[PDB]
Structure formats: structure tokens, C-alpha cells
Amino acid sequence: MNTVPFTSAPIEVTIGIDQYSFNVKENQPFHGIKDIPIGHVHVIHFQHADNSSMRYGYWFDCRMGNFYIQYDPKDGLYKMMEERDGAKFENIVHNFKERQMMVSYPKIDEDDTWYNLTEFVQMDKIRKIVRKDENQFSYVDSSMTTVQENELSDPAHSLNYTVINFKSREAIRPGHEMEDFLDKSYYLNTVMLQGIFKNSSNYFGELQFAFLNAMFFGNYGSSLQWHAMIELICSSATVPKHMLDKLDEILYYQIKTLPEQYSDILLNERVWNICLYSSFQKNSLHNTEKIMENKYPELL
Amino acid sequence: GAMNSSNYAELFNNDIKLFVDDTNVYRVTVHKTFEGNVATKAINGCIFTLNPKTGHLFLKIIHTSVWAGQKRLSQLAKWKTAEEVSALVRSLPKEEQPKQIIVTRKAMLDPLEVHMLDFPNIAIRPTELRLPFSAAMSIDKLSDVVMKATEPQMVLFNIYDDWLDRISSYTAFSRLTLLLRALKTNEESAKMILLSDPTITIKSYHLWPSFTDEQWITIESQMRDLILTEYGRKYNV
Numbered sequence: 001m002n003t004v005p006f007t008s009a010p011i012e013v014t015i016g017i018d019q020y021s022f023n024v025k026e027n028q029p030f031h032g033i034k035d036i037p038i039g040h041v042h043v044i045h046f047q048h049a050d051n052s053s054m055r056y057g058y059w060f061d062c063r064m065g066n067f068y069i070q071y072d073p074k075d076g077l078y079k080m081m082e083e084r085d086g087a088k089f090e091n092i093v094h095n096f097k098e099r100q101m102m103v104s105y106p107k108i109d110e111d112d113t114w115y116n117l118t119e120f121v122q123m124d125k126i127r128k129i130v131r132k133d134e135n136q137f138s139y140v141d142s143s144m145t146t147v148q149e150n151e152l153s154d155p156a157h158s159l160n161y162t163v164i165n166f167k168s169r170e171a172i173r174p175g176h177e178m179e180d181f182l183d184k185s186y187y188l189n190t191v192m193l194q195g196i197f198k199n200s201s202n203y204f205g206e207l208q209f210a211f212l213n214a215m216f217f218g219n220y221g222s223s224l225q226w227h228a229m230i231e232l233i234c235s236s237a238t239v240p241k242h243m244l245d246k247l248d249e250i251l252y253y254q255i256k257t258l259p260e261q262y263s264d265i266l267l268n269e270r271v272w273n274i275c276l277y278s279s280f281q282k283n284s285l286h287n288t289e290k291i292m293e294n295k296y297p298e299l300l
Numbered sequence: 301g302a303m304n305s306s307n308y309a310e311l312f313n314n315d316i317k318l319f320v321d322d323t324n325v326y327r328v329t330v331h332k333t334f335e336g337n338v339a340t341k342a343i344n345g346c347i348f349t350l351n352p353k354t355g356h357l358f359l360k361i362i363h364t365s366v367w368a369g370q371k372r373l374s375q376l377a378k379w380k381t382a383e384e385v386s387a388l389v390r391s392l393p394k395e396e397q398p399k400q401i402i403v404t405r406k407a408m409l410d411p412l413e414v415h416m417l418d419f420p421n422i423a424i425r426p427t428e429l430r431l432p433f434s435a436a437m438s439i440d441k442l443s444d445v446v447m448k449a450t451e452p453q454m455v456l457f458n459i460y461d462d463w464l465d466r467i468s469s470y471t472a473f474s475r476l477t478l479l480l481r482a483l484k485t486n487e488e489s490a491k492m493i494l495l496s497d498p499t500i501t502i503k504s505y506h507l508w509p510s511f512t513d514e515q516w517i518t519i520e521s522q523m524r525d526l527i528l529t530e531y532g533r534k535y536n537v
């Protein structure tokens with residue numbers, strides 16, 4: 001079990017850690033989060049009390065280094081930093097744990113929710129989207145645009161998601177216009193899975209990563225990217241049986257985790273109804289359809 | 301985006317454009333089978349591609365053989381239309397290719413947009429106008445060439461005959477829409493009007509009769525009367 005200490009908490013902030021959140025008060029004696037499960041990526045994130053504008057946070061993996069959080073009063077935010085001095089870090093953590101100034105990652109033992117939401121999100125693969133090679137952790141916020149959004153403006157601060165566009169030469173083969181447009185199996189299986197992504201695990205991690213950036217930061221382009229990948233599988237007549245089964249499980253746990261009150265914005269009525277009721281896979285998402293119907297019957 | 305009454309003079313400017321109308325592409329007659337079921341039999345159709353400025357009509361004959369062994373014909377008809385338009389564009393020299401293509405039904409937007417991906421600078425637009433191009437098959441010479449065709453075939457016409465020699469494209473298009481609207485609301489009566497006077501004839505190389513300016517006014521008036529008449533007969537006014 002690993003630790004992200006904080007130097008201090010000078011401004012009042014709602015801190016979120018994976019799917020849990022807690023309130024810290026201005027200049028409260030808070031020195032971080034302890035007992036973080038090793039084996040998974042994580043995301044610490046932030047929403048300031050006084051300006052709920054700009055949710056922002058860091059994706060990170062404890063196996064890749066010692067990381068801590070320190071407020072920068074010039075740039076006005078909680079920043080992740082890496083401590084290269086190992087004994088210094090161990091000494092800092094131990095003192096704060098002895099003084100009991102650290103909240104504990106609240107892992108219920110029955111609970112596989114974070115695992116099921118991050119089954120394919122690795123820290124190095126994450127680093128291929130949020131480009132900033134001098135850090136081992138990746139910063140994301142509400143307002144960061146995507147490569148494809150910038151086509152329709154600062155590239156250094158963008159989310160290099162995979163470009164999916166159904167009315168594009170990439171997606172449509174010359175002489176197969178109707179075929180490929182009504183049945184995207186060639187865009188899915190040959191262009192994207194075989195060719196851009198390499199396997200279904202990489203396709204699933206981006207989709208999983210897309211959803212989480214939408215949910216935790218309200219990043220619109222991630223939500224577009226999440227919707228874009230769901231629509232591409234559902235709109236394909238030919239999809240391996242195992243990708244369908246996994247997709248159904250992936251989606252179920254996303255819908256399960258979505259805050260009930262944020263569904264009106266995070267969920268695209270047209271995509272969901274098509275996926276669940278019209279598309280080729282309308283009969284292939286039993287779990288997701290059952291939870292969508294019992295929890296969000298209004299959207300449909 | 302879409303085309304309506306507020307941007308109507310754009311049709312007659314000097315940016316090349318074409319309307320596409322797909323109504324008559326897939327045409328069927330419905331009949332009873334020996335077992336008392338129902339069945340369709342297709343018949344030749346046509347794509348109605350029109351430059352509204354010049355009157356140049358690219359009439360693509362759709363021969364029933366294109367449907368043989370196919371499924372979901374109404375949806376295939378849209379994609380066949382888009383293929384054929386995109387082939388036509390490609391067959392035209394660059395300086396002749398349209399800058400915009402207005403479809404008369406919104407269902408054609410995606411099929412055409414996907415077929416024209418190689419042409420990113422050609423705008424594909426819908427329209428809010430109810431244009432009566434479906435009545436094109438009420439023009440006898442156009443009907444005749446479609447129904448006699450035994451293979452796929454492109455025939456070119458000028459839908460305005462020689463009218464641009466005397467009037468502008470705006471007026472020519474108006475005349476055309478008024479004639480087609482009339483053919484669509486009462487074909488028999490419209491045709492009666494057009495040929496009542498045996499001394500006015502249709503030149504071999506034309507589609508409509510050789511009316512003097514004054515005779516066109518009379519004709520146009522009678523077509524208006526008929527569209528109001530039938531509106532009065534329909535709605536009881």
C-alpha cells in the first residue's frame with residue numbers, strides 16, 4: 001500500500017481519489033492519502049471551494065515513483081511532484097502517518113469497482129495521450145481539448161485521443177460506401193483494432209480512460225471520445241464474441257458508477273438508444289441494457 | 301446549411317450548382333399474387349440532376365436490372381443515387397464540377413456526403429423548399445426515354461428549351477416550378493392546358509411547346525388557376 005503525502009492544504013478544496021471524494025478546509029492539518037492499492041493506475045483530482053471552475057487532477061501509478069502534492073500559490077493549484085530522494089520521502093511519509101494526518105484509501109474488500117473501471121488503463125499508455133514527457137504522472141482538466149476538437153488550440157495541452165470519424169476516408173473504403181457506412185466492421189476490426197490500436201485491450205483502455213476523464217473532470221471531448229468508441233463497436237455487424245461480452249461488463253460498471261444527477265449531460269440519448277435498440281449489437285449488451293433501463297429509463 | 305426562401309437568388313448566381321432529386325429512382329407497381337398476397341414489380345426510374353442556372357438536366361436512367369437480387373431497395377436507392385451523382389461529378393472537367401449540390405430530400409445527405417468524400421470543397425445541402433421535381437416523369441419525352449430504356453443510360457436535356465434567350469434563369473426556374481407543380485396536382489388538366497391549341501407544337505429538340513411571350517402568360521395564368529382550383533377541390537373552399 002502506497003502514499004501520496006501533501007505538504008499542506010492552504011486553500012479549501014474537495015479532493016477526489018478514484019471514485020471517492022472528501023472535503024478539506026482552508027489550512028486544515030491535512031497531509032495526504034495512505035493505503036492506496038498497488039497494481040492499479042489512480043487519479044487524484046481537485047475542485048476548489050471558492051472557484052468551482054476548473055476541475056483538474058493527476059493520473060499516476062505508485063510503482064513508477066514517489067509522488068506528492070504541494071500547493072503552488074503563484075499558479076494557484078495543487079501540483080503533483082516527484083520526490084527522487086527515497087529516504088527523504090520515506091521519512092516524510094512515516095512522520096505524517098505517526099501523527100495520523102493522512103486519510104486512508106477507503107477500499108471495501110468486496111468491492112472491485114475501480115479494477116472494473118480501469119481494467120486496461122496503464123500509466124505509460126496514458127502518456128501517449130496527455131503529452132508531457134518530463135513527468136511520470138499526467139495532468140488533466142475540465143477544459144483541455146482533444147486533437148480532433150482542435151481540427152474543428154494549444155497542442156501541448158491537448159488530449160491526443162484516437163481520431164474516429166464515420167464520414168471520413170479512413171472509415172470508408174472506395175467502392176464500399178454504403179457497405180462500410182451502414183456496417184463499420186472494417187473500420188473497427190481492420191483500421192482501428194488491427195491497425196491503429198493493435199488489440200482490443202488498447203481499444204478498451206482508451207474508452208475506459210475517456211469515460212473517466214468525462215466523469216471526474218466533465219471533459220466534454222473525452223465524453224465525445226467515449227461515445228465515439230461505443231458507437232463504433234455497436235454499429236459493427238462483425239465483432240468478436242469476447243469483445244462484446246467484455247464491452248457489456250465495461251459499460252455496466254460505468255453506468256453503475258455514474259452519479260445519478262450527472263446523467264443528463266454525460267449520456268448521449270441518440271448513441272444509447274441506437275446502441276441498445278437499433279444497432280447490430282442491440283441484443284448483445286444484456287447487463288448494460290438492464291442497468292440502463294432500471295436506472296435511467298427517462299433517457300430512453 | 302439549408303436552402304429556403306430567404307436565400308433564393310443564390311440559385312441563379314455564378315457558382316455552379318445542381319439539385320438532385322431521387323423521388324423517381326426506385327419505382328414500383330404493387331399487385332396481387334396468385335395466392336392472394338401482394339408483390340411489387342419495379343419499373344425503370346431516373347435520377348433528376350438539374351443545374352437551375354443553365355437548365356442543363358443530367359437524366360440518369362435507372363434500369364430495373366440494378367435491383368435484381370438486392371435487398372432493402374428504398375435504402376439502396378439513395379446510395380445508388382449518390383454513387384451515380386458522384387460518378388457524374390468525376391466525369392466532369394474541374395471547371396464544370398459543382399460547388400454545391402442541393403438534395404431535395406434530407407435522406408440523401410449522408411449517402412451523398414459519404415460518396416463525395418474525395419470532394420471536400422463541394423457543399424452538400426438540404427432545402428426547405430417543396431420543389432415539384434417528382435413530376436418530371438409527367439414530361440412525356442422524359443417519361444418516354446425512361447420507359448423504353450433497356451440498359452443503364454444517361455440522357456442530357458435542357459429543361460428550359462430555348463427560354464433563356466428571352467428571360468432570365470430566375471424567371472425560367474419559376475416557370476418550370478409552376479408547370480411541374482401543376483402537373484403534380486392534376487396531370488390530366490395540366491396536360492390539357494399545355495396542348496389544347498394544336499397550332500402550338502413541341503419542337504423535336506424541345507420538351508415544352510413553342511409559346512410566344514404572350515401565350516406563356518396565358519399558360520402561366522391557367523396553371524395558377526388550376527393549382528388554386530385543385531386546392532379548392534381538395535379542401536372545399
Ligand SMILES: CN(C)CCNC(=O)c1ccc(F)cc1
Nearest residue numbers: 017020021022023103104105106
Ligand atoms: C463524501 N463521501 C461520500 C464520503 C467519503 N468521505 C470521506 O471523508 C473519505 C473518502 C475518501 C477518503 F480517502 C477519505 C475519506
Ligand SMILES: CN(C)CCNC(=O)c1ccc(F)cc1
Nearest residue numbers: 121122125196197202205206209
Ligand atoms: C496506439 N495509440 C498510440 C493509442 C491507442 N490507445 C491506447 O493504447 C490507450 C490509451 C489509453 C489507455 F488507457 C490505454 C490505452
